[PDB]
């Protein structure tokens, strides 16, 4: 009797695709072709944040656009002073196998995680001088990929069990769980309003969950390979994802389909990290081929090349004010570009 | 750095630098290793002198004034394609194969083929442990080596069967500068720390030779 249910699901997908195509009256590129393209943007290595001794798997700018955490594979979690290249803090991690990192919007707490299946939260503004592990969150059976703070009391994580989880720090239990992916989710990006968030998985798909209720809102199937990064357009209603098939893509919440695809025949290496600009007019992207090719967010044209890294780019972040962009690669150095 | 507090912050940063380089030196000194293989293959019972410490399982035993680290990534229950590059800088890869499972042998073959032919592990050597001499050596007399490998033509004796399995597992290399070191284990009356020690010694010396301008 399951054949009837499968046919019902197939036909439902049929009219949902028909409605999606019907709403697709035109394309963003065709409409915006009248806007003048932005010229080649020259950015140079301003500051070389060095001090890490292994691959850097994540970074995160603070809300002040000056302090950023950088998580390495040597078990270190360094909080920098980007203006003067000063190391404000150097947290030693319990488990050296970490590939996610976070900085609380309030600035007090710092998250970390990786293959240990436990999200560790560290308190910085302790009454005593040193930084001690505030808590350890252990409810995942898969490796954690990305963790972002909501407030000082709530966190959101994605892990290898094809599942996202929203946690309350003061209790330590999964406040809410998000399931539905058939493959390992490798990244999430939190909206500016902290109400909706996307998550891209290794099944070449993305799903859009909420915080309040608990199940998915929208699904996006535009890629053909693994997804290794994700980010939001500043308005919070559009998001750009980076895949492993050397094609970035840009989707929209309201359109509930794919808007554009940034690709080039000269690039074959997959995308490891993506991030927008302060206004979203410009878009960056990190490529496995040692460079960082900037793609216009409205014309899909390659603008500039930040070819200054001696290894695969892993983490890439634009500050809250957009003053500079920090790129961290497996060469064990972050670099600041302006 | 003109003000007093900026000078003090620079002093604290220099202190942090001295720790980080110092940790980098101790950390660099230990020598690693990644445990793989199917379940129920002795991948958690290699050396009984463990000193361990669900997810990645660390083991930090020492031997001949060398700190050996073993990471058992079993129980992850996910896709290896996303975190296998975390171990890109390991010294070697220990792969354990259970010889008593004639149905899991092909799965182990595909797993070893995937591990050896990965783009990140092109030069990370492999130590191939073949567990349980006795169980396979009795079940070969109980059951011939034809249900699992119908292509076998050689003698059905123990030594020839073991050599044939070894040849099948080593045929997946097809790559240079990466070698496969063999040892046959049972986890019953064997001390298999010396094989790990000298395999890692060979790998480290080869890496040093290729990195010092020689070779």
């Amino acid at each position, epitope marked *: 009797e399951l054949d009837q249910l499968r046919q019902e699901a197939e036909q439902l997908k049929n009219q949902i695709r028909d409605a999606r195509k019907a709403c697709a009256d035109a394309t963003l590129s065709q409409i915006t072709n009248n806007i003048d393209p932005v010229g080649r943007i020259q950015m140079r290595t301003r500051r070389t944040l060095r001090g890490h001794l292994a691959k850097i798997y994540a970074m995160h700018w603070g809300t002040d656009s000056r302090l950023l955490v950088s998580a390495s594979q040597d078990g270190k979690l360094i909080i920098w002073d980007s203006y003067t290249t000063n190391k*404000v803090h150097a947290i030693p991690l319990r488990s050296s196998w970490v590939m996610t990192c976070a900085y609380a919007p309030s600035g007090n707490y710092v998250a970390c995680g990786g293959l240990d299946n436990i999200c560790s939260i560290y308190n910085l503004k302790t*009454r005593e*001088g040193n930084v001690r592990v505030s808590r350890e969150l252990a409810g995942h059976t898969g490796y954690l990929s990305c963790c972002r703070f909501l407030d000082d009391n709530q966190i959101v994580t994605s892990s290898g069990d094809t599942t996202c989880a929203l946690w309350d720090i003061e209790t330590g239990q999964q406040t809410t769980t998000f399931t539905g992916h058939t493959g390992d989710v490798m990244s999430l990006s939190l909206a500016p309003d902290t109400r909706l968030f996307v998550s891209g998985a290794c099944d070449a798909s993305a799903k859009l969950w909420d915080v309040r209720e608990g199940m998915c809102r929208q699904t996006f199937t535009g890629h053909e390979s693994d997804i290794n990064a994700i980010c939001f357009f500043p308005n919070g209603n559009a998001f750009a994802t980076g895949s492993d098939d050397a094609t970035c893509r840009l989707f929209d919440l309201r359109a509930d389909q794919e808007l554009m695809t940034y690709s080039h025949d000269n690039i074959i290496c997959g995308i490891t990290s993506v991030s927008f600009s302060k206004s979203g007019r410009l878009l960056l992207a990190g490529y496995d081929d040692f460079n960082c090719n900037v793609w216009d967010a409205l014309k899909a044209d390659r603008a500039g090349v930040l070819a200054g890294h001696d290894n695969r780019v892993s983490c890439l972040g634009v500050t809250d004010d957009g003053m500079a962009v920090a790129t961290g690669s497996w060469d064990s150095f972050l670099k600041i570009w302006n | 750095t003109l*003000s*007093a507090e900026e000078r003090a912050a620079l002093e604290r940063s220099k*202190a942090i630098e001295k720790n980080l380089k110092e940790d980098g030196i101790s950390a660099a000194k230990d020598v690693k290793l990644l445990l793989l293989g199917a379940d129920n293959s002795g991948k958690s019972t290699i050396v009984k002198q463990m000193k361990i410490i669900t997810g990645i399982v660390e083991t930090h035993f020492t031997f001949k004034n060398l700190h050996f680290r073993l990471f058992d990534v079993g129980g992850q229950r996910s896709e290896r394609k996303k975190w296998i590059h975390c171990f890109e800088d390991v010294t070697a890869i220990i792969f354990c194969v259970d010889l008593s499972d004639y149905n899991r042998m092909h799965e182990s073959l595909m797993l070893f083929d995937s591990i050896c032919n990965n783009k990140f592990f092109i030069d990370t050597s492999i130590i191939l442990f073949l567990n349980k001499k006795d169980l396979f050596g009795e079940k070969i007399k109980k059951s011939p080596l034809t249900i699992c490998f119908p292509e076998y033509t050689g003698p059905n004796t123990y030594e020839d069967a073991a050599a044939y399995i070894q040849a099948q597992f080593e045929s997946k290399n097809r790559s240079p500068n990466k070698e496969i070191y063999c040892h046959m284990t049972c986890a019953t009356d064997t001390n298999n720390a010396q094989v790990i020690f000298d395999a890692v010694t060979d790998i480290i010396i080869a890496n040093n030779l290729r990195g010092c301008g020689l070779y």
Partner: single-chain antibody
Amino acid sequence: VQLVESGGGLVQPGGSRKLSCSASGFAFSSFGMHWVRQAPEKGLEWVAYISSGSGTIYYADTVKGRFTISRDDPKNTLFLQMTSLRSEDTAMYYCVRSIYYYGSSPFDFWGQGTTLTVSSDIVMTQATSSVPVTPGESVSISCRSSKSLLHSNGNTYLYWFLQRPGQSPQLLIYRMSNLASGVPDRFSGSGSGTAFTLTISRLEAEDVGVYYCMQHLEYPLTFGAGTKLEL
């Protein structure tokens, strides 16, 4: 946390004495640590400072050579050796912690203190010394400097301390703009270079004490005379 001082008593002039301060409850190895005296009926006066890691050591203008400072991190202790004591050293000593990084809040915690008796410089000036006020009304006090404290980085280094009768003072506001931890929102700092204001809106009890403004632009650090609040 806890900072307990010892080594007090009466010392003949020209003698030598050790003061030992023990710290318990915090990572003492990562705190720059200050020694500050107060005369029996006068204001605070900076004496010495030793940096975390024993990298830099500073002494006041009047006490170079005679005094020396040291730290024993494993025991969590600070030693201060005084040599050739004079009649002006009959002051109560206070041992103060301060951690130095971006956004840190130094001079936050003070020890109980031990009284010991004996048988250019930025001139920080307070216009007033005593203002009769009642709990319920906002009260404002002012501080002045002989040199522009506003550095090029935009941080102006002013600290506000409140000493209660018979109690160790605490940091109230650092850099005249950031409220320290454990400090009520009633206190507010403002002003510009060489002109600082501290306002307590809706005054209440427990705030009756003496206020000190301290500069941190360059050593030697100089305190102020102090404004004493009365009912």
